[PDB]
Amino acid sequence: GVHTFEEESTSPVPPAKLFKATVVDGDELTPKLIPAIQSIEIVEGNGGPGTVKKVTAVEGKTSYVLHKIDAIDEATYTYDYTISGGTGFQEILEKVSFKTKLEAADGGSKIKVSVTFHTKGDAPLPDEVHQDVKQKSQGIFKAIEGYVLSN
């Protein structure tokens, strides 16, 4: 099954600053801010498209998922990535593809996302899986946003 969700939100942080923290410095900041995330390790690449990362978390059980950069562009505040594989990843998911873009709005940012869940089999995406992936996505982003506001 393919399950696509599009949403907009806002931040009081302007986009160059918010993009730098969430995307350019996201690999170093995320484990500093989210206690459960132990490490973000680059498996392949340079931080450009095609870069593969291993994200390790404690959910006392340690597990991991893999991220791939699909697109990244500082001038357009664009970051598209796919989460797939690993011991930490929901059994029912093949992958989740994220497309994220910021734009300047009202001294802060507008945030535009598209999230595509790919499930095994032909059943609806379970509400619990949608809720869990949205809560993790929001939690990381909002923890980084709070850190920027506190600096």
Ligand SMILES: O=S(=O)(O)c1cccc2cccc(Nc3ccccc3)c12
């Ligand atoms: O971490 S390891 O235990 O080898 C490992 C264990 C299990 C699955 C892995 C998948 C991709 C990369 C790894 N290692 C990796 C390679 C380069 C940098 C960081 C991690 C994986």
Ligand SMILES: O=S(=O)(O)c1cccc2cccc(Nc3ccccc3)c12
């Ligand atoms: O070999 S590694 O260098 O970690 C490695 C390097 C690059 C990519 C990898 C992907 C999956 C597993 C690995 N390692 C692995 C870990 C434990 C058992 C078997 C393989 C990967």
Ligand SMILES: O=S(=O)(O)c1cccc2cccc(Nc3ccccc3)c12
């Ligand atoms: O990769 S993260 O950026 O943390 C992440 C970000 C956004 C959504 C995620 C959904 C499932 C698992 C993740 N990580 C995870 C990693 C290791 C173990 C268990 C879950 C998600």
Ligand SMILES: O=S(=O)(O)c1cccc2cccc(Nc3ccccc3)c12
């Ligand atoms: O088969 S999965 O269940 O995803 C899986 C489960 C557990 C550990 C995995 C480690 C590396 C790649 C996988 N799959 C993969 C292969 C290519 C791209 C992305 C992920 C792993």
Ligand SMILES: O=S(=O)(O)c1cccc2cccc(Nc3ccccc3)c12
């Ligand atoms: O939740 S939102 O406010 O759109 C959101 C806010 C801020 C950052 C986000 C990053 C990735 C995905 C989101 N949304 C999303 C939508 C559906 C499923 C999973 C994540 C993000």
Ligand SMILES: O=S(=O)(O)c1cccc2cccc(Nc3ccccc3)c12
């Ligand atoms: O700390 S846990 O939730 O265990 C966690 C476990 C594994 C992976 C996680 C990835 C992102 C955010 C988390 N925490 C989080 C914190 C507050 C709100 C939303 C998500 C992750």
